[PDB]
Design an enzyme around this catalytic site. Structure first.
Site: not given
Ligand SMILES: [Fe+3]
Ligand SMILES: [Fe+3]
Lengths: 392, 168, 515, 132, 392, 74, 132
Positions: C133, C136, C232, C235
């Site tokens: 994150e 990102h 992702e 995640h």
């Protein structure tokens, strides 16, 4: 074929590219091309590190330094704010001030660790091919390294998890980056210790890389009793995120950690013929110095010298340091009982050698941290308190 | 009527002049507690400084915290509320209080008032955060029991709103 | 011994280290999460990708090198940064910087999942996610950083972290994928951030958008966003593991459907109108109707592959789904009215639908021409685009009884007299303050949890102030200090200035004064 | 099925009123369980080889329900049950070092339960830990 | 308005892109997309390493394995061919057969070394910050490491330059790549030794990193007399490019080089408290094992087992080995005189310690090279020959 | 000594090593080229770009990563 | 001179027979000493910043004879005497680590005597080792 349209690309499709070219103005609509040009640079020119990191955190004006306004859109049951001042005792005129001197945003951080990742595996493949493990002292290998360096991974692992609430709670972007990279470096240290043990097991028949014995030592051996108590307190006993970072890196890890990694396992590796462990401690000690640069900046440059709250912050930092230095001295007093188990080497494992190792650790620490927050410390008194646990 | 600018205005300036007159821990503690009861949370007494109260609160906190470090012994910073109470006692009292609450309406006011009274710098941060989390755990559990059980018309009555408009 | 040893070349692969990670934790009484949670069930789950720190860094650095090669070398030599249709280059000021705060809040939410995890393997996995994150966040920043350097309008690409605070669409972005993750139950983040946010909404928000970028000439955004989403799948897998533990425990499973419905509604309330508006109105070339993108990714695929499959195990289709589908069809057109009417408060340059846009809107949403179409065309005739017109549509809305309200919970604007999406106005007084709520799901949230929802709205902060003063104070100007960043057209000529806004005499009212 | 796995399957073929009538139909106000998985591969030299020589050959012979669609910057893949890719088989095709971690460099999105086992990446409809 | 045309790009310019699209066939004109699909793969499938490297050398059919035909276009005065069979005594059915098992074309080679380059500077910045030099034995640091490790750089440098004629003369592409990468690794070794000395100089006042003393020791100290004689002969006394590679890497460096680098400087660093030198020897030993894998393939898999010339090649390899092994045994006999100057450490520097070190070097060498070409060697005899230079 | 040392962060830059490279040669009778040449004049010149092996690799790898990114990705 | 450093200067302006007549003129059958240097920079984010804010600003201030032409994938630079670029000044402009070796990543070609000195790259008309 396919059921959905094959979209034409505006960059290369002639008809769409001509329409785009007609719509694009023949001149720029502003001359200001510096991304987040209003950030106050720490250095002589604004860095890409600052440009990509600074003010990503959407703080309002009621969290010092924030540029937004108004309350959060959604708070915890009871009212706890998404971020708030209640998260820490320390104060500042601007939580955004911190800068990592290494200027790590995500990309340079993983670029550097990837280099270490790939070179490590090349080094191991060649080291096993070299057969260089053949000259390591077997008692060191089996009874000290495997067991007590193994057990040390639990200290690195606990310091890693100490950062979980810090990653949620801390009040700015550059601080959050510093904290998260520090945490990964700590869990990397634990993983790298385990990698070395797994590697030795491939070369030494009967060498057991299970964590069973290291974990039993960490959790029950008096040698690590003080260290485990401190780690458990820093990780799970507090939530002030500045206290975690300070107590974790600038007190406990800068004294007990540096002694165990650098004065014990790395230093004694080069007295007992261990040509392997120095490759691994080279990484943990590089990580410690990078982390220190950033921890130093947050607590010394920013908080201990903040124009309005520097002395206020030093009051808390001095109270924390007194508490966790006591915790760390007890941890070292327990830890030096390990020397009763090693083969005596003049200047390294006798009382003079261990006294000089503690003088380096407490002397370096007084210079690197204590002097910069106004914490008075008598180095000889700390050395002598730890040496009370040394078995003559 | 007409709000002044967001970040620099006569209300914030006037409150800063009030805060500048605080000279003791006791006085600043009564000041911040009275301020939080009057101007924060849905149960506040007044919305007259709604767009400035959060900033003003921060400035009171800063004054109280500097007074603490200038005047109190170190051990008081760790173990005592600035009311003079024992911090661990404060924790135990309010956790027992919320666990005795008989409805989500009782529990919510206990949590909200704990924060109005004991938000740092009044209570030490470590003790406050774990107390606030224990309270929030209880409050979430009771609120998330049969969350959809009461129709909106019923919830409006239980909350005690004055319904000013319902679009057809 | 000292002579004989196996000299076969060996190293240690990541999975050989990883199998020992579970043993890195130890037992002590204080070893438990710091954060309030309802979920206390056993959660000793296994990480589905065996990452260790060295391999994490090796994988991510390899992605970066390719990405930054394409950007700094190839696309720069092609001049690609200025081959974007202006509507789309303006849309990326918003998409990338708004997504940036979503990613930034996901660092903190994932740290809460790290803290509340009990298995070392899951603490390990959430750390990798925390790292991603941050990755990102810096990727979204790099997009706008690159646009600042190479695109014909850097203003608003170059300062959104302050200029976003001016406008009302930003308020809801701080909830949708931000406050709504990190301010609440920490174990619940496996439901709201992950089961809903990552597994449902990141696909249209981060993947499907790259096709719209490409259609409109932007090859920068595909280069970055497609790399973003590669993280992702890890995640989503982290959160699925916890969802399983919740479902398997009868005491914890009795909270899950209400948390899922509240998460789904919270996220779709803003995501559905705002991304549909940005896709359809902030593009020249459209890929497909937004409502179809949403049907494909949200209702059919996420809804059937995640929620419908989990229905075998007591997870319910969100009760708010019907209300959401109505939003998917009309709510972004409703939002367009507000976006275009209040354009001076933004940081992007807008374009009224042109004749072929209007035909496409009417073909795909029959009824659009007679409602939205006629309004946009009247605004154009009144001089919407012309800085000398003295015309700003927000004042026109009020003079015809089309008040704009802000939802106290979601912060999404609502125009009840013009809206075709889901909503109806509820206005309550409580303890001397008036509150406007706009749907059954958020009204319940506010009624049960008023102290979670005290967000000041733009009308409360700006009451009685003139529009140009608010813009100037918030730095919503180009480097000359006078020309607005925001514009009601995408041409290079006749840009509006603060004095042009001032001549309209727009002053902010109190929308709830009439109640 | 292959027809059901098309990006524009079913209601997605309809436009205007026809679409709206099905979209708002009573039966379509709750989710419907799907046995499918969706895999998104971002376009690159390595991924394009994998698409043509693994997914569309061995993969589709194994699972004929596989549908691949060109979405400009990415490949959109939908199939019944599961999709799998063996990084060892990819490494052989590419002629360069290629672990399962390298495979993930350009795997952009997953609707379904995804995991790696050995050298293989799988995305499956199965609900591990819930299904038997 | 520049003086020359601003050329329109065919990829993005609408009218050129439309002309190109009209001209491009709607279907591929062949299905064979594997670059140099006809190379015989060494492994299960053709590697990118092989595709990029193999048959880049334009050899004709009269140099074994060449695919071209006819004489060279331009030869040396006298007639020496551009490449020719006269370049080496060894023979093969195909000079293209060699395969580096690390499959290094230029990119993976600099990618790996770049990793080492950047991590080395981070490690040094951290090590200096750590202060870890403080526990090194000063006598080792100043009288043995600085002087005789410094002097060893001349051996590495000479082996580097031995590759100059090899890079010109050798007869295939994969061989040329192996040789050139080996050469850079050797000059890297020499530069890294100098880097370490320059680094210590920054840390230790009065420590002199000039090469004057090392150079004088290499050129005149009896300890390196045999080593320097051997390097001079391999570098400048011969031109058979296979003899240079075999004598250099497979005999001299695999015995003298491995002893000096690994059994002397690396091993004894971990007996005298030297936490710095192992970081540098980690690189030279990794490089040695990578080089060895490629040298092994060329001389064992390709040449000593060439289906037609294997025994013929072993005849020369045996004669070379006999000669350069005698040169290296003499070099080692000279070198072990250095033990007379070190502090005694039982099991490391006593006669039993040096004997076991020589048993590892000569015994490893027997397995790694001698056994593979049929060269008979009595390990104990060579150990005893060297121990005659050991002063007890 | 064992307690006092300068702990300022330092490395060794490429030109610092390059400075010493001319000293790496040594004199022996056989130290000359193997190839025929007409040109026998003194040629003890300096290299214009002070490159060492580590820095050579770092420079070229950086070029490669950009190039292969553009090719394989974009 | 500035005019003489244009890519299409002099005979390069002529076409057809006009070009051939000068190209084959007796006096153009031997080389003519030039005081110019040519520097080619391949286009990239960093180089494009260097061109606009260094070469075309301070560079051309100090050396007004500099001509920069757009050659699609590279910048063609020609100037009288010498062209210099200080890598430290570029690193200040870019906000990221930037040694003289990093500067060389996109310095493609040089017609003239090129070398580095500290942080500065230089291409010069001077014949070092011959000119005093
Ligand atoms: Fe993300
Ligand atoms: Fe995520």
């Amino acid at each position: 074929p396919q059921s959905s349209q094959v979209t034409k690309r505006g960059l290369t499709d002639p008809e769409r590219a001509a329409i785009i070219a007609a719509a694009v103005p023949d001149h720029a609509l502003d001359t200001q091309r510096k991304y987040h040009y209003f950030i106050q640079p720490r250095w002589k020119r604004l860095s890409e590190y600052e440009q990509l990191s600074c003010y990503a955190q959407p703080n309002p004006d009621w969290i010092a330094g924030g540029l937004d306004w108004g309350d959060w859109t959604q708070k915890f049951h009871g009212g706890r704010p998404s971020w708030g001042n209640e998260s820490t005792e320390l104060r500042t005129t601007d939580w955004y001030r911190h800068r990592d001197p290494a200027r790590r945003w995500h990309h340079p951080y993983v670029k550097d660790k990837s280099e270490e990742a790939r070179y490590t595996q090349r080094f191991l493949a060649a080291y096993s091919s070299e057969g260089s493990i053949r000259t390591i002292d077997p008692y060191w290998r089996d009874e000290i390294l495997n067991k007590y360096f193994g057990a040390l991974l639990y200290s690195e692992y606990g310091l890693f998890n100490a950062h979980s609430s810090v990653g949620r709670d801390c009040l700015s972007d550059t601080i959050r980056q510093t904290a998260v990279f520090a945490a990964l470096d700590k869990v990397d240290n634990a993983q790298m210790i385990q990698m070395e043990r797994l590697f030795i097991a491939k070369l030494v028949p009967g060498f057991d890389a299970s964590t069973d014995v290291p974990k039993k030592i960490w959790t029950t051996d008096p040698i690590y009793s003080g260290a485990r108590a401190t780690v458990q307190e820093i990780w799970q006993g507090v939530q002030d995120w500045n206290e975690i970072l300070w107590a974790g890196h600038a007190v406990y890890d800068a004294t007990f950690g540096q002694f165990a990694r650098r004065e014990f396992f790395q230093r004694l590796a080069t007295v007992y013929g261990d040509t392997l462990t120095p490759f691994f401690t080279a990484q943990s000690q590089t990580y410690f110095q990078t982390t220190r640069g950033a921890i130093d900046d947050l607590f010394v440059y920013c908080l201990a010298n903040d124009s309005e709250f520097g002395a206020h912050n030093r009051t808390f930092l001095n109270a924390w340091t007194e508490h966790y230095l006591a915790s760390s001295v007890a941890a070292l007093k327990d830890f030096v009982g390990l020397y009763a188990k090693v083969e005596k080497v003049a200047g390294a494992t006798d009382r003079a050698g261990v006294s000089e190792a503690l003088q380096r650790v407490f002397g370096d620490w007084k210079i690197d941290y204590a002097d910069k927050i106004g914490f008075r410390v008598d180095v000889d008194q700390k050395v002598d308190a730890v040496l009370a646990g040394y078995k003559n | 009527a007409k709000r002044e600018p967001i970040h620099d205005n006569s209300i914030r300036t006037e409150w800063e002049a009030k805060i500048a007159k605080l000279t003791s821990v006791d006085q600043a503690t009564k000041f911040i507690q009275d301020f939080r009861l009057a101007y924060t949370s849905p149960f506040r007494k007044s919305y007259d400084i709604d767009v400035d109260y959060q900033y003003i609160e921060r400035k009171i906190e800063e004054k109280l915290s500097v007074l603490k470090t200038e005047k109190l012994p170190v051990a008081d910073l760790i173990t005592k509320a600035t009311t003079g109470e024992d911090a661990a006692a404060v924790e135990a009292t309010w956790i027992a209080k919320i666990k005795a609450a008989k409805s989500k309406y009782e529990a919510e006011r206990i949590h909200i008032e704990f924060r109005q009274l004991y938000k740092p710098p009044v209570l030490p941060v470590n003790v406050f955060l774990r107390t606030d989390a224990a309270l929030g755990t209880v409050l979430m559990e009771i609120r998330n029991t049969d969350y959809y059980g009461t129709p909106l018309e019923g919830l409006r009555k239980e909350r005690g709103v004055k319904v000013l408009h319902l679009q057809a | 011994d000292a002579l004989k040893v196996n000299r076969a070349p060996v190293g240690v692969e990541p999975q050989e280290v990883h199998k020992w990670l579970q043993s890195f934790n130890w037992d002590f009484k204080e070893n438990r999460t710091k954060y309030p949670t309802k979920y206390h069930m056993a959660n000793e789950t296994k990480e589905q990708f065996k990452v260790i720190a060295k391999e994490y860094a090796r994988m991510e650095a390899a992605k970066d090198e390719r990405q930054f090669g394409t950007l700094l070398d190839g696309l720069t030599r092609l001049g690609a940064g200025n081959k974007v249709h202006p509507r789309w280059g303006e849309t990326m000021k918003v998409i990338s910087n708004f997504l940036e705060v979503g990613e930034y809040n996901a660092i903190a939410a994932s740290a809460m999942l790290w803290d509340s995890a009990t298995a070392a393997e899951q603490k390990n996995g959430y750390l990798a996610q925390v790292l991603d994150e941050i990755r990102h966040t810096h990727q979204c920043a790099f997009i706008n950083h690159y646009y600042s350097k190479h695109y014909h309008d850097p203003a608003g690409h170059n300062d959104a972290r302050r200029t976003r605070a001016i406008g009302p669409l930003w308020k809801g972005m701080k909830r949708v994928f931000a406050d709504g993750f990190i301010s609440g139950d920490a174990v619940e983040c496996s439901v709201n951030l992950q089961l809903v946010g990552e597994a449902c909404f990141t696909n249209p928000l981060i993947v499907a958008v790259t096709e719209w970028a490409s259609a409109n000439g932007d090859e920068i955004t595909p280069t970055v966003f497609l790399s973003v989403e590669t993280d992702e799948l890890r995640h989503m897998a982290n959160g699925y593991q916890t969802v399983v533990s919740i479902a398997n425990d009868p005491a914890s499973a009795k909270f899950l459907n209400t948390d899922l419905n509240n998460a789904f509604w919270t996220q779709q309330k803003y995501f559905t109108p705002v991304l549909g508006y940005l896709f359809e109105y902030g593009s020249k070339f459209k890929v497909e109707p937004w409502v179809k993108t949403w049907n494909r990714w949200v209702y059919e695929d996420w809804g059937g592959i995640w929620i419908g499959r989990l229905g075998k195990y007591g997870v319910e289709s969100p009760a708010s789904l019907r209300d959401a589908k109505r939003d998917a069809y009309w709510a972004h057109h409703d939002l367009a009215l507000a976006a275009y009417a209040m354009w001076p408060l933004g940081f992007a340059r807008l374009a009224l639908p042109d004749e072929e846009d209007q035909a496409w809107f009417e073909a795909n949403y029959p009824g659009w021409a007679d409602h939205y179409g006629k309004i946009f065309n009247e605004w154009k005739k009144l001089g919407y685009e012309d800085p000398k017109s003295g015309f700003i549509p927000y004042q026109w809305l009020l003079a015809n009884g089309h008040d704009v309200y802000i939802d106290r919970v979601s912060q999404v604007p609502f125009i009840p007299s013009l809206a075709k999406g889901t909503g109806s106005l509820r206005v309550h007084e409580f303890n001397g303050k008036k509150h406007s709520l706009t749907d059954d799901w958020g009204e319940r949230q506010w009624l049960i949890e008023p102290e979670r929802y005290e967000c000041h709205n733009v009308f409360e902060q700006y009451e009685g102030r003139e529009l140009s003063e608010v813009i100037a104070e918030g730095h919503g100007v180009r480097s000359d200090g006078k020309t607005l960043i925001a514009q009601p057209h995408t041409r290079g000529d006749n840009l509006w200035t603060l004095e042009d806004i001032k001549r309209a005499g727009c002053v902010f009212p109190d929308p709830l004064a009439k109640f | 099925s292959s027809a059901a796995n098309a990006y524009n399957a079913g209601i997605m073929q309809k436009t205007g009123k026809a679409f709206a009538d099905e979209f708002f139909a009573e039966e379509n106000q709750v989710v419907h369980e799907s046995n499918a998985v969706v895999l998104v591969l971002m376009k690159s030299d390595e991924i394009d080889a994998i698409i043509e020589d693994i997914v569309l050959k061995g993969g589709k012979a194994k699972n004929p329900s596989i549908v691949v669609e060109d979405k400009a910057g990415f490949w959109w893949i939908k199939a019944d049950g599961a999709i799998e890719i063996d990084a060892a088989e990819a490494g052989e095709l590419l002629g360069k070092p290629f672990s399962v971690y390298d495979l993930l460099i350009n795997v952009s999105s997953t609707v379904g339960r995804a995991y790696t086992l050995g050298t293989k990446f799988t995305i499956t409809s199965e609900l591990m830990g819930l299904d038997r």
